[PDB]
Every structure is written in structure tokens, then in C-alpha cells.
Amino acid sequence: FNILLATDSYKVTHYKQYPPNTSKVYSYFECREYEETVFYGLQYILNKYLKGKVVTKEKIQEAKDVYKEHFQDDVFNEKGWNYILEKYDGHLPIEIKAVPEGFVIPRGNVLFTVENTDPECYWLTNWIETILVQSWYPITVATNSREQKKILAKYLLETSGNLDGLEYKLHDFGYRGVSSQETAGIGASAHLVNFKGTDTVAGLALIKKYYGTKDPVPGYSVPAAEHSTITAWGKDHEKDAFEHIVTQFSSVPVSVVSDSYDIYNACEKIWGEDLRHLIVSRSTQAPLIIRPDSGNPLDTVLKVLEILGKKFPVTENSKGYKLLPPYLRVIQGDGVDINTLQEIVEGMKQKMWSIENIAFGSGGGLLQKLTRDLLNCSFKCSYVVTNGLGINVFKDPVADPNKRSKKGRLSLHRTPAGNFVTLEEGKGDLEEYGQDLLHTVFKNGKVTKSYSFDEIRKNAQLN
Amino acid sequence: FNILLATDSYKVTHYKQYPPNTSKVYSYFECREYEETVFYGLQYILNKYLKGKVVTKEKIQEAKDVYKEHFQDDVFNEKGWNYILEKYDGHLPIEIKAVPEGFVIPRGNVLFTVENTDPECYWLTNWIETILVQSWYPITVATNSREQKKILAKYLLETSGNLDGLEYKLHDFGYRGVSSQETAGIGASAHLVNFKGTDTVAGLALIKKYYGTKDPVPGYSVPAAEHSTITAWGKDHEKDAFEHIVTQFSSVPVSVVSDSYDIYNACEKIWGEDLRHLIVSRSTQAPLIIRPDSGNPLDTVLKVLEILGKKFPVTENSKGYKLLPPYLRVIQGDGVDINTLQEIVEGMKQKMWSIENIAFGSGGGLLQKLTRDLLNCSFKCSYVVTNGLGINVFKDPVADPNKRSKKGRLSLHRTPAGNFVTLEEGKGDLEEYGQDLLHTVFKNGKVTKSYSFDEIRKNAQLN
Numbered sequence: 001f002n003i004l005l006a007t008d009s010y011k012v013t014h015y016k017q018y019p020p021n022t023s024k025v026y027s028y029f030e031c032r033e034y035e036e037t038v039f040y041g042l043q044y045i046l047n048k049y050l051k052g053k054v055v056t057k058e059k060i061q062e063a064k065d066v067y068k069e070h071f072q073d074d075v076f077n078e079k080g081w082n083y084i085l086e087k088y089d090g091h092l093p094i095e096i097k098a099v100p101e102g103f104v105i106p107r108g109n110v111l112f113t114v115e116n117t118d119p120e121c122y123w124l125t126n127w128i129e130t131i132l133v134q135s136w137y138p139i140t141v142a143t144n145s146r147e148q149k150k151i152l153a154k155y156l157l158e159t160s161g162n163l164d165g166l167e168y169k170l171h172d173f174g175y176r177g178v179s180s181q182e183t184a185g186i187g188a189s190a191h192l193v194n195f196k197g198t199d200t201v202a203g204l205a206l207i208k209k210y211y212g213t214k215d216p217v218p219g220y221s222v223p224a225a226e227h228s229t230i231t232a233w234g235k236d237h238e239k240d241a242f243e244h245i246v247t248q249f250s251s252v253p254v255s256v257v258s259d260s261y262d263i264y265n266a267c268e269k270i271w272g273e274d275l276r277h278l279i280v281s282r283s284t285q286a287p288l289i290i291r292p293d294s295g296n297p298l299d300t301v302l303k304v305l306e307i308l309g310k311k312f313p314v315t316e317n318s319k320g321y322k323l324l325p326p327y328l329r330v331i332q333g334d335g336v337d338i339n340t341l342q343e344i345v346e347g348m349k350q351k352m353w354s355i356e357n358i359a360f361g362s363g364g365g366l367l368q369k370l371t372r373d374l375l376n377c378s379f380k381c382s383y384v385v386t387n388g389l390g391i392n393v394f395k396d397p398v399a400d401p402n403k404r405s406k407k408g409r410l411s412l413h414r415t416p417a418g419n420f421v422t423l424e425e426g427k428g429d430l431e432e433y434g435q436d437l438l439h440t441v442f443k444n445g446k447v448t449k450s451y452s453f454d455e456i457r458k459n460a461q462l463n
Numbered sequence: 464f465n466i467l468l469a470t471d472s473y474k475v476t477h478y479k480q481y482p483p484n485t486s487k488v489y490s491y492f493e494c495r496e497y498e499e500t501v502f503y504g505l506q507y508i509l510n511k512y513l514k515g516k517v518v519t520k521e522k523i524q525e526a527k528d529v530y531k532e533h534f535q536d537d538v539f540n541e542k543g544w545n546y547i548l549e550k551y552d553g554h555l556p557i558e559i560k561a562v563p564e565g566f567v568i569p570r571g572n573v574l575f576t577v578e579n580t581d582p583e584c585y586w587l588t589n590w591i592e593t594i595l596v597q598s599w600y601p602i603t604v605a606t607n608s609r610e611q612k613k614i615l616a617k618y619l620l621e622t623s624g625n626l627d628g629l630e631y632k633l634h635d636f637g638y639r640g641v642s643s644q645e646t647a648g649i650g651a652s653a654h655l656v657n658f659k660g661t662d663t664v665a666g667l668a669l670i671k672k673y674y675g676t677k678d679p680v681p682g683y684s685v686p687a688a689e690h691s692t693i694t695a696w697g698k699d700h701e702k703d704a705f706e707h708i709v710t711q712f713s714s715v716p717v718s719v720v721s722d723s724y725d726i727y728n729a730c731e732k733i734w735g736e737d738l739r740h741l742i743v744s745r746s747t748q749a750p751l752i753i754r755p756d757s758g759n760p761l762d763t764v765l766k767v768l769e770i771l772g773k774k775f776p777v778t779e780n781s782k783g784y785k786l787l788p789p790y791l792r793v794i795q796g797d798g799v800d801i802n803t804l805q806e807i808v809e810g811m812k813q814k815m816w817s818i819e820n821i822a823f824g825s826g827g828g829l830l831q832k833l834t835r836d837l838l839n840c841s842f843k844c845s846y847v848v849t850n851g852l853g854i855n856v857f858k859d860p861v862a863d864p865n866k867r868s869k870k871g872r873l874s875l876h877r878t879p880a881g882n883f884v885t886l887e888e889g890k891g892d893l894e895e896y897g898q899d900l901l902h903t904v905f906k907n908g909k910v911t912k913s914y915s916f917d918e919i920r921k922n923a924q925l926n
């Protein structure tokens with residue numbers, strides 16, 4: 001990796017575009033205008049990409065050579081990057097202040113600021129927009145995962161009367177569904193801010209290296225089947241595959257995808273009759289979790305439950321809602337996003353089914369079907385000093401008030417009703433709102449404040 | 464990186480689920496039945512992740528330790544992975560056959576096949592599903608980029624009478640709007656299969672290291688402004704920013720975002736009157752590219768052009784379509800995906816505007832607003848040998864016919880009419896068709912067949 005090569009092409013040219021005698025560019029990150037967002041992911045970027053000696057003689061010459069051919073001119077700022085190398089031993093003269101990781105912030109507030117600490121490096125603040133704005137993703141996953149926790153919590157509380165197993169109810173299936181190994185880790189780490197159930201292994205090593213937990217790993221799995229391990233027995237032997245699988249994993253929970261041929265037959269005839277004896281004997285600590293994986297998600301869950309309710313002893317819990325015996329659960333792991341997770345719980349509740357009957361697997365919903373669009377994640381200049389005069393800088397497009405940017409030096413404050421407000425135009429220094437809630441997280445190549453994954457989990461908890 | 468940590472958790476448990484006496488698992492990848500999809504990206508994964516010594520004593524012990532905590536049990540196949548280390552010096556005993564990269568194959572056809580080469584490693588075929596299936600992303604970017612090239616080609620040919628500059632008409636803007644650095648490089652490399660214009664610099668080093676080009680670089684940029692470099696001059700000095708920027712970049716093409724306050728004023732009064740004189744003097748090899756970045760994309764482009772047509776000398780070209788003078792072009796960079804790119808060119812054509820007037824930049828649309836669900840990218844077991852007898856295996860969910868999988872040993876063939884067929888049940892060995900178009904790309908830890916980025920470009924041409 002080379003930070004000189006980790007920006008949008010055009011930013012290479014920007015040091016020739018700013019007003020002359022510009023000593024300071026100051027830029028903020030907000031989720032412009034999902035009423036509240038989990039701030040998480042910055043600390044990864046600060047450590048993996050921004051901290052320490054990031055500039056070397058070789059990194060300057062590589063960039064020089066690529067940009068020379070990429071632009072077909074020598075528009076690269078060699079002098080500016082050689083200054084970083086020789087003044088600061090390659091350490092970025094940037095100061096980043098940020099709200100603490102895990103913080104649940106209303107939309108349209110300052111979550112971090114970037115500014116240069118050396119007037120020579122005025123151009124450096126917005127060089128690192130592109131890299132810093134990839135934060136959108138950890139923030140977005142963490143927010144959409146938490147929104148889903150909220151829906152599950154609402155219907156579990158309504159149909160059971162507690163949150164038991166809440167943080168194991170949305171399993172991450174998204175390892176194949178993402179754009180990369182780097183993306184898998186960050187995405188799966190963002191979901192583990194809210195839940196403890198993941199198949200995306202890469203997330204675990206990231207949290208250990210970048211955040212830390214007191215526990216060995218932040219996330220857990222149980223044994224489960226895929227279509228390869230059922231269908232490999234042959235279209236005539238589904239029962240043999242199931243029987244081998246529940247018996248191999250007799251003492252632990254086990255997911256078995258049951259839609260290889262006929263979900264409704266596998267539930268009713270194979271689990272419900274021929275193998276019923278291997279399921280009703282199993283421990284409360286080791287249920288069979290029947291996985292449908294195809295068809296209308298809501299219709300399939302409701303017919304799966306009706307079949308299972310008629311072949312197994314169903315309890316009515318305190319709330320008047322029906323419950324499988326504790327050895328038997330369901331997980332819908334196909335076509336699940338925040339919208340369909342909500343269609344299912346509401347559909348289950350209208351049929352008087354407890355939500356403790358159902359778990360969710362999401363892959364693409366949770367980790368891939370997200371954009372910087374969704375929460376309008378955005379990095380803009382708000383303040384510059386030219387000729388010694390600080391001036392308040394913003395965009396305010398004619399046709400889009402939604403894209404207006406915030407003016408001048410920003411601080412984040414607690415209101416007397418204990419809500420958040422971003423103060424603009426350096427009005428934070430009028431101490432009308434107490435102290436700035438953002439902290440210095442990065443200064444002059446060093447990480448100056450960091451959070452355990454446990455602290456972030458605590459910060460991110462639901463009301 | 465540790466391939467023992469680079470799979471779905473549940474696949475760790477799969478070696479205890481397959482029928483006993485299973486010597487071979489054979490699995491294929493399809494874009495299950497965007498009519499045609501560019502295969503690109505496998506070679507990256509084979510080199511970065513699968514080739515050489517991938518197993519070490521330390522990588523087995525690390526996996527054992529993580530999975531012990533992750534499963535709350537020792538379900539890990541240490542014996543199976545120690546065999547790989549001690550038999551094959553950690554080289555995967557896998558054979559992957561793949562269609563040549565850049566090959567444009569209709570939906571529902573085998574693109575790559577994975578099989579174990581040693582009976583002991585039956586479990587290893589689907590260990591690498593997760594990692595291999597991330598290919599959906601390079602494939603989907605490459606295909607969606609190409610389908611957009613098709614629409615550009617259609618409307619340019621209809622309104623100009625050639626495809627001049629087609630490879631620079633869709634610029635990659637999506638570096639900040641992807642989920643990570645690794646994803647940027649892959650996605651930007653996938654787009655450059657079809658175009659030459661990128662701001663996603665990370666794509667350059669990937670193509671150089673993994674694919675190779677005869678030219679210095681596969682992709683090119685020009686100097687261009689952001690909101691920070693216009694608004695930094697002060698709300699009332701937009702004209703000074705513009706004038707500084709186009710004068711700095713007098714002799715090369717220059718993109719200038721003009722929606723900082725009011726796009727329509729900046730086109731009509733600032734470009735069209737105040738600074739008119741520095742635009743009409745510019746070389747045909749260095750035009751001003753006015754970038755609107757806000758509003759209804761179609762409505763904005765149409766009023767932008769109507770304003771510019773009334774301040775600058777417009778020609779009607781041979782097709783009856785209108786043309787800005789050669790020093791003046793427009794780029795819509797904001798809200799651009801395949802569907803809005805199509806709304807715009809069709810809207811432009813209804814207002815008799817040549818498509819050679821307009822360039823497109825795409826960020827989120829191009830690199831992130833893509834899912835594994837779009838082309839149904841899918842990896843399934845089709846054939847296993849159990850007790851020495853091959854059996855043809857598949858899924859066939861009753862309630863989703865389109866998730867039915869192919870049976871048995873697969874090959875890809877040219878038809879008599881120059882189309883493709885995927886043969887099933889090992890029918891390829893009848894040579895009633897020509898010969899299998901999949902080739903050995905990976906065998907027993909080696910990349911065996913590779914393609915230059917140039918070969919891939921050639922294969923991925925339009926008609």
C-alpha cells in the first residue's frame with residue numbers, strides 16, 4: 001500500500017486549484033440531512049493506512065511515475081510530499097477529531113473533522129477524503145445491522161417478554177456476497193458491533209488487531225449444512241444426509257438446510273415423521289435449526305412453522321404466542337434484508353407465532369446491498385485560512401438544499417434536553433453548550449485516542 | 464492472510480457431513496438464468512490467495528485456536544489440513560478449469576469448475592467456494608460497465624455516426640463510495656475491461672501486478688475540480704476559482720464542478736459571459752468540461768446544454784443532432800447508474816442533442832450499487848464419487864425452479880450457430896460438439912494458464 005496512490009486521480013491536481021496563500025483546509029464528515037447512525041470504522045483506517053511513516057523515497061517515485069503516465073503530464077506534487085518525508089519522517093501533519101466509536105448520532109451532525117497542522121500541507125486534508133470516506137461502509141453496516149436488532153427486539157419483547165438470545169438472532173452469511181477479503185473483515189466487524197453470530201471469519205482477526213475484546217473472539221458460529229453436503233448423498237438419500245448430520249452434531253446446535261428438493265416434505269415427512277426420534281431427544285443447548293433457503297421468505301417461514309407445529313409439541317408462552325419445543329428452531333437465511341426481516345416477524349406475529357421461533361441469516365442485505373447513498377455519507381470543506389483570514393466555506397447547490405454543506409469550524413455539543421447539535425462558524429468557542437464532544441483521535445502520524453470493541457459495543461446498545 | 468480463516472464458519476464442519484467413502488467433490492460456478500456476462504477476476508484470486516504454499520504449521524495452529532473459541536468446540540479438520548502441508552508442501556490439490564477471461568457467455572452456462580485431485584481432499588473443493596465466489600463482483604462490474612458501453616455505443620452511433628471517444632465516456636468516480644481499498648482496485652480494474660477513464664487509482668497497480676498491459680497504464684485521467692477547490696475561494700469568488708483553474712490547466716482537458724452555488728448561473732453568466740473569452744480560445748485537445756453535480760440528472764443535463772447552446776456556437780452534425788464547439792463538453796457525474804445513463808442519452812436524443820456532447824462519471828452506481836443477486840452468481844456441487852461410483856448431484860427446490868442446479872460433469876461448447884451450450888452428465892466426452900472451452904487455470908498450487916489485460920480487453924469487445 002501507498003497513500004500517494006490511495007486518492008481519486010483529480011485530487012492529485014488540487015494543490016494547483018486552491019486560492020494562493022492558503023495555510024489551512026479544514027473538512028468534516030457527516031451522514032447528510034435511518035434517523036441516527038452508529039459511528040464506527042475510523043480507527044481501522046487510522047491504524048492500517050494513515051499512522052506512522054506513510055511516505056518514503058520509493059513511494060514518492062512510484063506515484064511520480066504512475067501519475068506521469070496516468071495524466072500524461074507531471075502534475076504530481078513531488079515537493080509537497082518530499083516536505084512530509086524530510087520534515088516529519090513521512091508522518092502526516094493532519095489532526096483528526098472524532099465522536100467516540102459506537103456513538104449513536106442523529107443524522108446531519110459532525111462525526112469527524114480533518115485539518116492540516118502545517119501550512120505547507122494545506123492540500124493534504126482533502127488528499128485523504130477518498131480513504132477516510134470509505135468509513136461510510138463500516139458506519140452503514142453497523143447502522144443497518146442495529147436497525148434490524150431494533151425490529152427483532154420490538155417483536156421478541158412483544159411475543160416472548162424479553163430479549164433472550166437477541167444478539168445471536170441475525171447471523172452474518174455475507175462472506176461470499178461481498179466485493180473483497182478486506183470488505184468481508186470490515187463488514188463482519190461492523191455487524192458484530194450489534195450481534196455475536198457470524199460465518200464471516202475475516203471479521204474476527206480485524207477486531208482482535210484493530211479494536212480488541214476481553215473475550216477470545218467477538219463472534220461465534222454453530223455447525224451447519226450447505227446444499228453440497230445434503231445433495232452429495234443423492235436425490236434418493238436426503239433422509240440419510242439429515243440423519244448423519246444431526247448424529248454427527250448430537251451435542252451442539254446444528255443448522256440443516258432442508259429445501260434441497262422439497263422444504264415442505266423435508267419438514268413434514270423427513271424431520272416430522274421418519275427422523276422425528278433423533279430431534280425430540282436433543283438437548284435444549286443443541287436444537288435442530290431447520291433452514292429453508294428458497295421461495296417467498298414470509299410464505300415459506302409460515303408454512304414451515306404450521307407443518308412443524310402439527311408434528312411437534314407446541315407451547316403457548318406467557319404472551320399467548322406459540323413456541324416450538326426447545327430442541328427445534330427455524331432460520332430464514334435467503335432474501336433477508338431489513339425490509340423482509342420486518343415482513344416476516346410481523347407476519348409470524350399476525351399468525352400468533354413467537355419471534356423466539358425464528359433466527360435470520362443475511363448475506364447481501366447485511367454486508368453488500370449498501371451504498372454511501374443510503375446514509376448520505378459525505379466529506380466537505382467547511383473552513384480555510386487564505387492570507388491569514390479564516391473564511392467559512394460551503395456548497396449550497398441551487399437544485400438541492402439536501403447537499404448544502406455546513407459552514408466554518410465545527411463542534412458537537414449536548415443540548416439541555418441531552419440531544420446533539422453541531423455548532424457552525426466556530427460558535428463552539430462561545431461556551432453556550434459546554435465542551436466539544438469530538439476528541440483528537442489522530443495528530444501528526446499518531447493515534448491519540450482509541451476504543452476497545454467492548455467500549456464500542458457498550459456505546460452502540462439499544463434504548 | 465490465512466486461507467484456513469478465509470471460508471464460511473460452517474464449511475469448517477462440512478468434512479463430517481459428506482457421504483462416507485467420497486473421493487471427489489466437483490463444483491461449478493454459473494451466472495444462473497443482463498443476458499450476457501463478462502468473465503473477469505478469477506486470475507486475481509488464484510494469484511493473490513490460492514497459489515503456492517497456502518498452508519503452514521502456524522496457519523493450522525492459528526485456525527485451530529480461533530475455531531476453538533468461535534464454535535465453542537474442536538470441530539476443525541486438523542488432519543485434513545496437515546495432509547495438505549505434509550503431502551504437497553501446503554499447495555492446494557485442486558483443479559480449476561475456467562472460460563478465458565473477457566469471454567462473454569450467456570447466462571446459465573458453466574464459467575469455472577473446481578475439483579479435488581486427491582481423494583483425501585474431497586472436502587477442499589467447497590472450502591474455496593466462499594473465496595472463489597467473490598468473483599461475482601469483478602464479473603458483475605465488468606458486465607454492468609459493458610452493458611453501459613452498449614447503450615453509449617447505440618446512442619453515439621445513432622446521433623454522431625461513429626464511436627469516437629467511447630472508451631472515455633464513462634468515468635469511474637466510485638473510489639470513496641466502495642467498502643474498502645481492496646474493493647476499489649478490483650472494481651476499477653473490472654470497469655477498465657470496457658473503458659480507459661478512471662479516478663480509481665488503486666485499479667492501476669492491480670492490473671500491472673495481476674494482468675499486465677503493453678501501455679504504461681490501463682487507465683487515464685485529466686485535471687478536475689471538487690467542491691473544496693471552488694468554494695475555498697469564497698462564496699462570491701466562484702468566477703475567480705473557475706478562472707484560476709482553467710488557466711492553470713490551459714493546454715489540457717479540465718473538468719470543473721459548476722454547481723457549488725447555481726449551475727445554471729455559472730453556465731450562463733460565469734462560463735457564458737465573464738470567462739467566455741478563456742473557453743473559446745482553448746484547444747480541441749483541451750476543452751472545458753462543465754460538471755453539474757446536482758438536481759434531476761436528466762432535467763439538469765438538458766437545461767445545462769440549452770444554456771450552453773445559447774452562449775456558444777452550436778453546429779448541427781451530419782445526423783441532424785446539435786454539437787457544442789469542440790472546446791466545450793459536459794460530464795454528468797452524480798446519480799449515474801445504467802438506468803439514469805439511459806434516461807439521459809434518450810432524453811438528450813429526444814431534444815436533438817448529440818451524445819458526443821456528454822460524458823458520464825459514475826461512483827456508487829459503477830462500483831458499489833451491485834449485488835451477487837443481479838446475475839445470480841452461484842457455486843454448486845454437480846458431481847461426487849462415493850465408494851468409487853460417480854453420481855450426478857444437484858439442488859431442485861420445489862418452490863424456486865430458477866435455483867435448480869446443473870447435474871454432473873460439465874463442459875462449455877460452441878454450438879453450430881456460434882452460441883454457447885453447457886453440457887451436463889459428462890455428455891462433453893461424446894465430442895458431438897467441438898471441444899470444452901473451459902481450460903485448466905489452476906492445478907495443484909500453480910496458475911497454469913494466464914491472460915494479459917489486453918487479451919481480456921480484446922475478448923470483451925462489443926460487436
Ligand SMILES: NCCCCN1N=C(c2ccc(NC(=O)N3Cc4ccncc4C3)cc2)C[C@H](c2cccc3ncccc23)C1=O
Pocket residue numbers: 164165166168169171172173174197199220221222224225253255289291329330331333356357358359361471473
Ligand atoms: N451461538 C450460541 C447461541 C445459539 C446458537 N444459534 N445459532 C444460530 C445459527 C448460527 C449459525 C448458522 N449458520 C447457518 O445456517 N449457515 C451458515 C451459512 C453461511 C453462509 N451461507 C449459508 C449458511 C448456513 C445458523 C444459525 C441460530 C439459532 C437461533 C435459531 C432460531 C432463533 C434464535 N433465537 C435467538 C438466538 C438464536 C436463535 C441459535 O441459537
Ligand SMILES: NCCCCN1N=C(c2ccc(NC(=O)N3Cc4ccncc4C3)cc2)C[C@H](c2cccc3ncccc23)C1=O
Pocket residue numbers: 008010627628629631632634635636637638660662683684685687688716718719752754792793794796818819820821822824826
Ligand atoms: N485522455 C483523453 C480522454 C478524453 C478527455 N475527456 N475527459 C473527460 C473527463 C475526465 C475526468 C474527469 N473527472 C472528473 O470530472 N472528476 C474526477 C472525479 C472523481 C470522483 N468524483 C468526482 C470526480 C470529478 C471528467 C471528465 C470527459 C470528456 C468527454 C466529454 C464529453 C464527451 C466525451 N466523449 C468522448 C470522450 C470524452 C468525452 C473528455 O473528452
Ligand SMILES: [Cl-]
Pocket residue numbers: 225226227257
Ligand atoms: Cl448454503
Ligand SMILES: [Cl-]
Pocket residue numbers: 173177333334335336362363364365
Ligand atoms: Cl444472501
Ligand SMILES: [Cl-]
Pocket residue numbers: 688689690720
Ligand atoms: Cl466533489
Ligand SMILES: [Cl-]
Pocket residue numbers: 636640796797798799825826827828
Ligand atoms: Cl456517485
